[model samples]
Target: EDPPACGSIVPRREWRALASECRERLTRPVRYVVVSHTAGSHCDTPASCAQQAQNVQSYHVRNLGWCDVGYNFLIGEDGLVYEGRGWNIKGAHAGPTWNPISIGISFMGNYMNRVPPPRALRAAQNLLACGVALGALRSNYEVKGHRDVQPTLSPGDRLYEIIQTWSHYRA
Candidate 1:
């Protein structure tokens, strides 16, 4: 579990610096940030797979196109942050329009039926804090669940509720 930069497994804290840089460069200030739990409380190895072994390995993410992962940042059950598309660029997490404006972050678990581990939550919070401090985000930035954008119950009910409770998100 290292920073997704240069394919090195660096610590997530280190990646925060990178995210901050990208956010600062954007013509439009990074306002809203997105978060999604990747696994349920009972996930096994390869947290993204969770119950399903297969997934959108190269899921769409706007101009970024399809790569290994779709998110700009991906947190694992192990509490590690795996960098995705990076900031300052459009994302594909919540359709095409939202991609240009928001940074897409997904956890590697099915949170609908499961609660995320404390460590994962803490990492997410820290990542958010990092985003905020770097001026790439604002205090008003909303940390949202993927389901908020689409009709599908993504990131799960239980997990979305957790984010709502902890981050003071509305709706």
Candidate 2:
């Protein structure tokens, strides 16, 4: 599907509206937040997102022998946010402990060697902020990379370290 345009993903306040729109269908609300890949600055275009997605989503889950895509949201290299597993269902991204309590969101590049584009960073932050507004997603909502809980290079140290600098997930 053609994803939402840059900076037009989902507003924080519209969450309630989403709830209202789909109240009957929603079983539970979003809890925790999880990120997948960290895109490098080199991937500043839509093509970058598409190219990176092939590996980011496949290798980590399909090749690695996991359930589904490692994340529920894909923050493209184009600085746009794409929905992954959809809301309302449990995600397989965070493993057992964090899985049930979290929502997975992955960026399509390694931003360590290359900084994330401003639009991409904001899109990521915006998703977290949206998570905060939903039920059970306050300070307790953990923001972690696949590596933090599982033993793997996924969402490598460089990207993980940068994420920690954000107030939404860190101090």
Candidate 3:
């Protein structure tokens, strides 16, 4: 079967995520997008990436004792967008200030030295467009690197360079 023209968000069930206990909400028509990277290895296929998604969720849920996976979404090199907190919920990816205001979409690997494959990039892009279409994000959304809102080198150097070229990037 052909994939949807707009990228589909891989749901929590598909990744076998534990039921989320998180309750914080994000107002619709969000105006900011925060991009980040996991600083971990990347997976090139759906099978591996699914496992990768599971691992991240486990770390944030079981190890860190967080309510759920931190980011609003995770982008895989398999060209998939894995739902984390999803669009309507606030995320823990950025600190309290930005968390309530932006959608945090993180890549599944370190991009400090190397860039994500083109497929991975497109998946995140499609997810953004999906958010806009759904009115979850404002049409005039601002794209900010994680570091732009915080002190850490989150989205990483290489990918940070690339995001800066994006049309909506603000910093």
Candidate 4:
């Protein structure tokens, strides 16, 4: 079957993600978007980002025993969007409650003290706009940092501060 359409996502085939094992589909017009950071090393090139993407999937599947990568999408420092479970499946990035109701997008890098490049930030914002336009996300959807709903400091302080300024951000 064709992969579910998400605006300009670098298809799973491109990143070589394992066949997705997610079973539950999120209801359309998802009202929330959770942003996170990998907190691992960052990559700035397509080839490097692809490898990082693979490594994330490997850890999630091989170490955590997840069906696939926990995130619904991953943003590369290279200014590209890498597909994870896409828009349809529920992600495991956040806890049970949020996972079923929101899309989880993890940025590939530690952002505690630093912020992503302009291009990467632009790409992520563009992705969200596309999601709204495609009706995958509610027009009034809310954006939250992973730290907002969960206890961890994911998405890092720098990123969290930036996302709060976005039009869709809530709390």
Residue 133: error of model 1 in Å? 1.5
Candidate 1's C-alpha runs over 4 A off are 1-28, 38-68
**Poorly placed runs, candidate 4 (over 4 Å):** 1-6
Each model's lDDT = 0.58, 0.58, 0.91, 0.91
Worst 10 residues of 2 by lDDT: 16-25
- Give one digit per residue, the lDDT tens place, for model 2 in 1-171: 333223355322322111211121223455457776644323556555555555554565557664444455677658777654555555666567777677777777665455566787888887666654554356355566677777766565667777787665633
> After superposing candidate 3, which stretches have Cα over 4 Å from the reference?
1-7
C-alpha root-mean-square deviation, each candidate = 7.3, 7.9, 2.7, 2.9
**TM-score order of candidates, top first:** 3, 4, 1, 2
Task: Quote each prediction's TM-score.
Answer: 0.68, 0.65, 0.95, 0.95
Model 3 RMSD in Å is 2.7
> What is the per-residue lDDT of model 1 for residues 78-128, given as tens digits with 9 covering 90 to 100?
665555555555555677656667777777767766777887777677776
Q: How are the candidates ranked when ordered by lDDT, highest leading?
A: 4, 3, 2, 1
Give the winner by lDDT: 1 or 4: 4
Candidate 3 TM-score versus the reference:
0.95
